Structure formats: C-alpha cells, structure tokens
Motif scaffolding. Structure first.
Motif, PDB file in Angstrom:
ATOM      1  N   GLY A  61      39.976  54.128  -3.606  1.00  0.00           N
ATOM      2  CA  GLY A  61      41.236  53.811  -4.278  1.00  0.00           C
ATOM      3  C   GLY A  61      41.718  54.933  -5.179  1.00  0.00           C
ATOM      4  N   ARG A  81      42.631  55.334 -16.055  1.00  0.00           N
ATOM      5  CA  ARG A  81      43.980  55.879 -15.961  1.00  0.00           C
ATOM      6  C   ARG A  81      44.781  55.017 -15.001  1.00  0.00           C
ATOM      7  NH1 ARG A  81      44.739  61.329 -12.820  1.00  0.00           N
ATOM      8  NH2 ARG A  81      45.278  59.781 -11.215  1.00  0.00           N
ATOM      9  N   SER A  83      48.580  55.228 -12.637  1.00  0.00           N
ATOM     10  CA  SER A  83      49.154  56.124 -11.643  1.00  0.00           C
ATOM     11  C   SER A  83      49.774  57.353 -12.297  1.00  0.00           C
ATOM     12  CB  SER A  83      50.191  55.344 -10.810  1.00  0.00           C
ATOM     13  OG  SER A  83      51.142  56.176 -10.162  1.00  0.00           O
ATOM     14  N   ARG A  84      49.549  58.514 -11.683  1.00  0.00           N
ATOM     15  CA  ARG A  84      50.180  59.775 -12.096  1.00  0.00           C
ATOM     16  C   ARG A  84      51.711  59.713 -11.939  1.00  0.00           C
ATOM     17  NH1 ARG A  84      47.871  62.830  -8.437  1.00  0.00           N
ATOM     18  NH2 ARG A  84      45.851  61.849  -8.912  1.00  0.00           N
ATOM     19  N   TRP A  89      54.398  54.291  -7.585  1.00  0.00           N
ATOM     20  CA  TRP A  89      53.416  53.213  -7.536  1.00  0.00           C
ATOM     21  C   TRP A  89      54.075  51.825  -7.575  1.00  0.00           C
ATOM     22  CZ3 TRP A  89      51.538  49.402 -10.915  1.00  0.00           C
ATOM     23  CH2 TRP A  89      50.332  48.809 -10.516  1.00  0.00           C
ATOM     24  N   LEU A 147      48.203  50.589 -13.855  1.00  0.00           N
ATOM     25  CA  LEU A 147      47.103  50.434 -12.901  1.00  0.00           C
ATOM     26  C   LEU A 147      45.746  50.288 -13.599  1.00  0.00           C
ATOM     27  CD1 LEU A 147      46.049  50.168 -10.037  1.00  0.00           C
ATOM     28  CD2 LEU A 147      46.345  52.616  -9.716  1.00  0.00           C
TER      29      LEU A 147
HETATM   30  O1  LIG Z   1      49.172  60.331  -7.767  1.00  0.00           O
HETATM   31  C1  LIG Z   1      49.573  59.257  -8.186  1.00  0.00           C
HETATM   32  C2  LIG Z   1      48.908  58.006  -7.775  1.00  0.00           C
HETATM   33  C3  LIG Z   1      49.671  56.923  -7.336  1.00  0.00           C
HETATM   34  C4  LIG Z   1      49.040  55.741  -6.945  1.00  0.00           C
HETATM   35  C5  LIG Z   1      47.643  55.648  -6.991  1.00  0.00           C
HETATM   36  N1  LIG Z   1      46.984  54.463  -6.599  1.00  0.00           N
HETATM   37  O2  LIG Z   1      47.576  53.391  -6.569  1.00  0.00           O
HETATM   38  O3  LIG Z   1      45.804  54.497  -6.287  1.00  0.00           O
HETATM   39  C6  LIG Z   1      46.890  56.742  -7.430  1.00  0.00           C
HETATM   40  C7  LIG Z   1      47.520  57.919  -7.823  1.00  0.00           C
END
Ligand SMILES: O=Cc1ccc([N+](=O)[O-])cc1
Ligand SMILES: O=Cc1ccc([N+](=O)[O-])cc1
Lengths: 269, 269
Positions: A61, A81, A83-84, A89, A147
C-alpha cells in the motif's frame, strides 16, 4: 468544550502527524532527534524526541511514517503519513468494502486501508513491542492525518488487547468501515480513539454512508476556521455513531479545512 | 510598536496580495465580488470589493494581478502577483541591472522587474487613471507579495506625481535596484511605501548587496514565527537605508518565512 489536558494532547499529536509529512528524510538513521521544516512540529522539537524506525512506500500500500521515542512526554508514537497528493487520493478514492473477521466479529472495512496496513502489520507490530518492552511505563500512541488517520485507526483496532494500551489520535481521517466496525471502534477496550475533525473538512465525509461506511463514536469537532488558531473552546465532543452537528452536515464540503488541524498539516511550507 | 490602524492596513493589503495568487480571477468579469479559496483573504471578502481589471501573463514579464475597487475602504488597489513557484523563481533569479532615468536620475533597477513593468506600464496606467477619475475620493494603493511586491514598488515609483498619491504595501519583496533608487523610494512624496519583511525571509535579501543592490527605508519587520499570529507588538520599524537588525541579518534564510505574512501568502491551501 474539552479539557486543556485534552487540547494539549490533540495539538501535540497533530504535530506528530504533520511530522510524517515534513520531518526531513525518511532515509534517516534511527537515533537522531525529530525535526520539521517550516515550523510544522515545534512541540515535538521542544521535547526529547527521536526516531526509532522510518518507513517509506513500504508494503503493498506504499505506507509511510515513523516510530518515535519521546522521553519528555513519556510516549511511544507510531505516526502515519497521508498521501503526498490529497486532491488526487480523494478523487481516486475507491469505496469497496472487505471483510475483517480477524480484527472484528462481523465487520467490513475499507479494502485499501485494510490491505495497506495488513501488508506491514507484522514488522510494525514487532517494532512497537520492542519499544513497549524497553519502556513499560511509556504510553503507546497511534496517530495520523488523512490517509494516516485511517491507517492509525486500523492498526489501533488490530493491535490492541495485548497487555499494553494503544491510544489513537486521528486527524481528518476518512470513514474506515461499516456499521459494525464503527461499534467495535466505539466500545473496544485497550485504549481510547480520539477522532478529530475540522469544520466542513471533506475527508471525514468519505467514503459516503451511502456506500456502507459508518463513523465510530465520538468525534471531536473543531469549529474554528481554516488558518485560525485553535483553542479548547473551539472543539466540541459529539456522541453517537454517525452523529450530525459536527463534520457530518448536509452543507458544502472543503479541501483547505482538511489541511489545517491546529496548524498546517498534510502539506509543508 | 505600530498603531492598531496601521496593523489593520498591513493585514488588509497582505490579503489583497494573497488574493493575487488565490483569487478566482481571469474569466472573472468587471464587477465580480473578490473572493479567495482556503480563507486566504477574508478581510477582502468582508469588504465591498470588486475587480476592475484582471490580468494574467501580460507582456514580456508574464505579469499577473488584478485592479480592484473597494467601496468599503475607499480604495483603488492594484495587486501584483508573485511567482507560481517561488523556489524555481529564486534559483533562476537574474541579478542584471538596467538604467531607469524615467523614474529617477542616475537610477538603476533590476533588469527584469523594470522590463516586466515597462511592457505593461501604459496599459495599467490607463486603467488606474480611469478609476482615479470615477473615484477621485478614493486612495490609490499598489500592493504585492514577493515578485508581486517588486513590481508594485517599481510601478508606484514610476506612476507617482501625476496628480494622485500612490501608496505601496509590499510583502517579502526583493531589493529593487541600486542605492540611488533606494534613497529615491525612501523620500519620493505623493505616496508612502510600507516595505514589510518577516523574520529570516530569504527574498528581501536578494538580489544581494554585493551585486549593486540596496534596500529602502523604513522596513517593517515581523518578529513572530512562521504560522504564528501577528500582533501589534511583533512588528518593528527599522530606520536607515540598508539597516541590519530586521530581515537583513547574517543567518540562514528561509523560504517558509516568506509564505507567512499575517497569514498564508504566495501559496494556496
Ligand atoms: O504519492 C502520493 C500517494 C497517493 C496515494 C497513496 N496511497 O493511497 O497509497 C500513496 C501515495
Ligand atoms: O511560473 C512562475 C514564474 C516564475 C518567474 C516569472 N518571472 O518573473 O518571469 C514568472 C512566472
């Protein structure tokens, strides 16, 4: 509307959550003091707070965060953390449910949130147990925003009941499962979950109830606006599974409100 | 250390400055109420404030900004917008100077700011002139953040002395030109310049003194931290061309300190 002791805890862990975004270099060694860019975690910096383990894109994930020893506030802190890129997302947010009968005797949780965690539960359960051993009197606390909120909530419910209490502070976390999971998250022993939300933040409004998702009780709702400092009088406790009169209003939602939890969060100056 | 009124004026024009970035401008016809996303300009929203002329990527300078009427505060505000991404604007910042005797004798300003303004000078003078005619009672005010702050100081230096006063409020604006221009801006009547800096902000330190550049007097310096509220006591009036003790001090500069002038500015939640 809540205690000052509670306000201090909410602010402290909101800053721990933000450090999951702005705590320079996940490719850092274990042992070094925890610091943030752009004043993201001043109260974390004030305290004797060091990394124990850092993880990035880890598992199926792509989970990210840190485990931290705080020797001032006497805590062990697993921080996730989010989402970046929250906008993405959010738009890309899958609503499918999955059975979680290990954790929960008749519960469906979010397939993505459940899976991301389940893929790293083992390693991370170990890392925490080693700390809990090294610091028996230290409070074990799980925290996250967006997240990370959800991931903390799922880790918390999955790792509780093993002799040590795990408290969960989540910040703008999305709904994490069905009605039964909501109840298991409400009454579960071996900790307290403090589920913090901010005004018309969009994220604790997703996935929608209209998709089988339900919110654990209670909710600590921040009434004060975006970019406004938070005081203990701006946070209202709201009892009742899927309660209204907090973040769960019929009004128009908002992304900025998601990025202001006691201070800037989910992005870094 | 500054009056409550002056403070209110500083906060107001910080938000007109941030409105340059976070406004709903361009394809926002004349007469449109000015609003910002992510609580970036509440004070501007509270006022009876409308667009008179938006502009984006105008002339050789890719100059962006708006002209606003404010019936509440009795203003004609020409807000200039800084860069869409500051870090890359900084690393690419040209230090060359060109002559500007059209503004003052023996004056030289950053070739770039002065070219960008020139390419749009005639057009924006006209639009300001129109509005000075309809509302001669209204105080003309030029404001901007960062690069926007630069354009404003050069625009208002050029356009002063044509009947109406032009005030300038600037927010983490870089040095504009050589010493002879600094002295000019410090004295030029028909409009006060309020040059505002925040702690260890990197921008008001470029282009460096060593490259022929010099800052005007006075400087209003904000003591309070990044993401901290500003109160009247956190602002300091710093006298003297090129004075040290305000922003111009020998410590590491900071990009995040550039993004907190009374609130978030130069980026949008
Ligand atoms: O890079 C951004 C990012 C977006 C979604 C997720 N996720 O949902 O795993 C992880 C990183
Ligand atoms: O897109 C950012 C940007 C950077 C620099 C400039 N400029 O000063 O030319 C304009 C826009």
């Amino acid at each position: 509307e809540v205690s000052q002791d509670l306000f201090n805890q909410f602010n402290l862990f909101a800053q721990y959550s933000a450090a999951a975004y702005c705590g320079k270099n996940n490719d850092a060694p274990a042992g070094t003091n925890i610091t943030c860019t752009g004043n993201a975690c001043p109260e974390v910096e004030k305290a004797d707070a060091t990394f124990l383990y850092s993880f990035e894109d880890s598992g199926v994930g792509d989970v990210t965060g840190f485990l931290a020893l705080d020797n001032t506030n006497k805590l062990i802190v697993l921080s996730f953390r989010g989402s970046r890129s929250i906008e993405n997302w959010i738009g890309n947010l899958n609503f499918d449910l999955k059975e979680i009968n290990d954790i929960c005797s008749g519960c469906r949780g979010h397939d993505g949130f459940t899976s991301s965690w389940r893929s790293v539960a083992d390693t991370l359960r170990q890392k925490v147990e080693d700390a809990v051993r090294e610091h028996p009197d230290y409070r074990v606390v799980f925290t996250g925003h967006s997240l990370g909120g959800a991931l903390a909530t799922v880790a918390g419910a999955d790792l509780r009941g093993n002799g040590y209490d795990i408290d969960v502070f989540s910040y703008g976390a999305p709904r994490v499962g069905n009605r039964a999971f909501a109840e298991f998250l409400t009454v579960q022993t071996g900790g307290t979950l403090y589920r913090i939300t901010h005004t018309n933040d969009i994220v604790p409004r997703l996935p929608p109830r209209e998709f089988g998702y339900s919110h654990s009780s209670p909710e600590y709702w921040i009434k004060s606006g975006t970019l406004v400092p938070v005081t203990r009088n701006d946070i209202v406790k709201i009892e009742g599974i899927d309660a209204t009169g907090g973040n769960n209003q019929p009004n128009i939602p908002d992304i900025p409100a998601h990025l202001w939890y006691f201070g800037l969060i989910g992005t870094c100056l």
